[PDB]
Design a protein around this motif. Structure first.
Motif, PDB file in Angstrom:
ATOM      1  N   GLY A  10     124.306  25.355 -64.044  1.00  0.00           N
ATOM      2  CA  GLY A  10     124.992  25.000 -62.714  1.00  0.00           C
ATOM      3  C   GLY A  10     125.258  26.111 -61.636  1.00  0.00           C
ATOM      4  O   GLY A  10     125.799  25.571 -60.608  1.00  0.00           O
ATOM      5  N   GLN A  11     125.250  27.326 -62.189  1.00  0.00           N
ATOM      6  CA  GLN A  11     125.699  28.272 -61.391  1.00  0.00           C
ATOM      7  C   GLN A  11     124.867  28.676 -60.110  1.00  0.00           C
ATOM      8  O   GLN A  11     125.222  29.042 -58.998  1.00  0.00           O
ATOM      9  CB  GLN A  11     125.694  29.730 -62.020  1.00  0.00           C
ATOM     10  N   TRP A  12     123.420  28.438 -60.340  1.00  0.00           N
ATOM     11  CA  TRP A  12     122.443  28.506 -59.107  1.00  0.00           C
ATOM     12  C   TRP A  12     121.610  27.203 -59.111  1.00  0.00           C
ATOM     13  O   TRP A  12     120.698  27.180 -59.243  1.00  0.00           O
ATOM     14  CB  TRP A  12     121.653  29.702 -59.295  1.00  0.00           C
ATOM     15  N   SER A  29     113.428  27.449 -54.285  1.00  0.00           N
ATOM     16  CA  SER A  29     114.718  27.347 -53.886  1.00  0.00           C
ATOM     17  C   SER A  29     114.820  25.831 -53.030  1.00  0.00           C
ATOM     18  O   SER A  29     113.839  25.429 -52.344  1.00  0.00           O
ATOM     19  CB  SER A  29     115.485  28.207 -52.746  1.00  0.00           C
ATOM     20  N   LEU A  30     115.581  25.205 -53.838  1.00  0.00           N
ATOM     21  CA  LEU A  30     115.653  23.427 -53.154  1.00  0.00           C
ATOM     22  C   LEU A  30     116.331  23.752 -51.901  1.00  0.00           C
ATOM     23  O   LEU A  30     117.385  24.413 -51.688  1.00  0.00           O
ATOM     24  CB  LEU A  30     116.668  22.725 -54.130  1.00  0.00           C
ATOM     25  N   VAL A  31     116.050  22.941 -50.863  1.00  0.00           N
ATOM     26  CA  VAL A  31     116.604  23.183 -49.565  1.00  0.00           C
ATOM     27  C   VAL A  31     116.701  21.601 -49.018  1.00  0.00           C
ATOM     28  O   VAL A  31     117.474  21.799 -48.005  1.00  0.00           O
ATOM     29  CB  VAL A  31     115.701  23.980 -48.435  1.00  0.00           C
ATOM     30  N   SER A  32     116.427  20.775 -49.444  1.00  0.00           N
ATOM     31  CA  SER A  32     116.944  19.357 -49.091  1.00  0.00           C
ATOM     32  C   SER A  32     116.505  18.486 -50.247  1.00  0.00           C
ATOM     33  O   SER A  32     116.077  18.849 -51.443  1.00  0.00           O
ATOM     34  CB  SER A  32     116.191  18.917 -47.905  1.00  0.00           C
ATOM     35  N   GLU A  33     116.709  17.375 -50.064  1.00  0.00           N
ATOM     36  CA  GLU A  33     116.412  16.328 -51.217  1.00  0.00           C
ATOM     37  C   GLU A  33     114.931  16.263 -51.581  1.00  0.00           C
ATOM     38  O   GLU A  33     114.380  15.907 -52.597  1.00  0.00           O
ATOM     39  CB  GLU A  33     116.769  14.843 -50.813  1.00  0.00           C
ATOM     40  N   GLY A  57     117.596  21.583 -61.826  1.00  0.00           N
ATOM     41  CA  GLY A  57     118.700  21.528 -62.708  1.00  0.00           C
ATOM     42  C   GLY A  57     118.503  22.008 -63.848  1.00  0.00           C
ATOM     43  O   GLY A  57     119.322  21.535 -64.968  1.00  0.00           O
ATOM     44  N   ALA A  58     117.538  22.907 -64.091  1.00  0.00           N
ATOM     45  CA  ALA A  58     117.448  23.774 -65.347  1.00  0.00           C
ATOM     46  C   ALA A  58     118.085  24.914 -65.478  1.00  0.00           C
ATOM     47  O   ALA A  58     118.501  25.606 -64.505  1.00  0.00           O
ATOM     48  CB  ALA A  58     115.639  24.045 -65.713  1.00  0.00           C
ATOM     49  N   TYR A 105     124.063  19.729 -61.140  1.00  0.00           N
ATOM     50  CA  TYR A 105     123.054  21.119 -61.398  1.00  0.00           C
ATOM     51  C   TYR A 105     121.845  21.098 -60.329  1.00  0.00           C
ATOM     52  O   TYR A 105     121.128  21.830 -60.672  1.00  0.00           O
ATOM     53  CB  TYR A 105     122.526  20.663 -62.910  1.00  0.00           C
ATOM     54  N   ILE A 106     122.043  20.308 -59.545  1.00  0.00           N
ATOM     55  CA  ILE A 106     120.673  20.262 -58.506  1.00  0.00           C
ATOM     56  C   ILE A 106     121.406  20.064 -57.204  1.00  0.00           C
ATOM     57  O   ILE A 106     121.690  19.190 -56.555  1.00  0.00           O
ATOM     58  CB  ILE A 106     120.036  18.973 -58.655  1.00  0.00           C
ATOM     59  N   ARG A 107     121.376  21.216 -56.200  1.00  0.00           N
ATOM     60  CA  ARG A 107     121.816  20.942 -55.264  1.00  0.00           C
ATOM     61  C   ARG A 107     121.159  22.213 -54.185  1.00  0.00           C
ATOM     62  O   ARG A 107     120.575  23.317 -54.617  1.00  0.00           O
ATOM     63  CB  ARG A 107     123.327  21.724 -55.108  1.00  0.00           C
TER      64      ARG A 107
END
Ligand SMILES: N=C(N)Nc1ccc(CO)cc1
Length: 248
Positions: A10-12, A29-33, A57-58, A105-107
């Motif tokens: 969950g840190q990153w 890197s996730l940048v939107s949904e 979320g891993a 965990y996913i942001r």
């Protein structure tokens, strides 16, 4: 990541793993949904789009987690200027086949504006599941690694890469790139980390300052990692995602 430490889950939460035919090959890197940023060189034209997956979320790639989500890709959009190894434009937008739901965990990570300045020496963090030294894989169960690295200007970085350089290599940090690491090496991103985030702190928040791109053997002295600057592509990323998938 060499010379770093294990993050905790969950840190990153913007860090994703990109696999090709089931093998982790790059970070993103996730940048939107529905959109991830990674490096263009992670998506050579001869690879088949349907053989990629993105795991979000891993924390431990080899461990089952009910928080992790795995997706295929609907679109891979490398920057058109990316010509070959070492080129400017080493950045790609990936549209997931379906949107995900953000969670603990996913942001997504905030993107910088076109003129966002991250100063020399800022301590940002690079993360990934890449090698933990040259040619040494991260051991199962593969907990995400993190490493704090100061930003090194492209001018300094170009001078460092010139030291004891092979004349046949360009090793040229372009105008759309920055470096981060240590002149004395030992701490750096490695193969398998490329495409992943260089996350920088600004005003209590975190921004995607860079995308891990290239370098010589990780942790070598005078060879800090080179990163594509997200600010250099802010306009393109915003134009592309806004036209292709506006937020209703
Ligand atoms: N950081 C370095 N000195 N090397 C390095 C090696 C590979 C990648 C991409 O996977 C990024 C950087």
């Amino acid at each position: 990541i060499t010379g770093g430490s294990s993050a905790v889950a969950g840190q990153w939460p913007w860090q994703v793993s990109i696999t090709y035919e089931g093998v982790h090959v790059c970070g993103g890197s996730l940048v939107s949904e529905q959109w991830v940023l990674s490096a263009a060189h992670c998506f050579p034209s001869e690879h088949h789009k349907e053989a990629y997956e993105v795991k979000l979320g891993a924390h431990q790639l080899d461990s089952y987690s009910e928080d992790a989500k795995v997706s295929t890709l609907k679109d891979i959009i490398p920057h058109p200027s990316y010509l070959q190894e070492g080129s400017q434009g080493d950045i790609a937008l990936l549209q997931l086949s379906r949107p995900i739901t953000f969670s603990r965990y996913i942001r997504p990570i905030s993107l910088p504006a076109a003129q966002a300045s991250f100063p020399n020496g800022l301590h940002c963090t690079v993360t990934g599941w890449g090698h933990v030294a040259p040619s040494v894989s991260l051991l199962t169960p593969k907990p995400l690694q993190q490493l704090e690295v100061p930003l090194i200007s492209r001018e300094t970085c170009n001078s460092l890469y010139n030291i004891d350089a092979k004349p046949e290599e360009p090793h040229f940090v372009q105008e759309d790139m920055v470096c981060a690491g240590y002149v004395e090496g030992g701490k750096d991103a490695c193969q398998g980390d490329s495409g992943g985030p260089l996350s920088c702190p600004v005003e209590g928040l975190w921004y995607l300052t860079g995308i891990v791109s290239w370098g010589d053997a990780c942790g070598a002295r005078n060879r800090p990692g080179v990163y594509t600057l997200a600010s250099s592509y802010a306009s393109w990323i915003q134009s592309k995602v806004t036209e292709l998938q506006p937020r209703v």
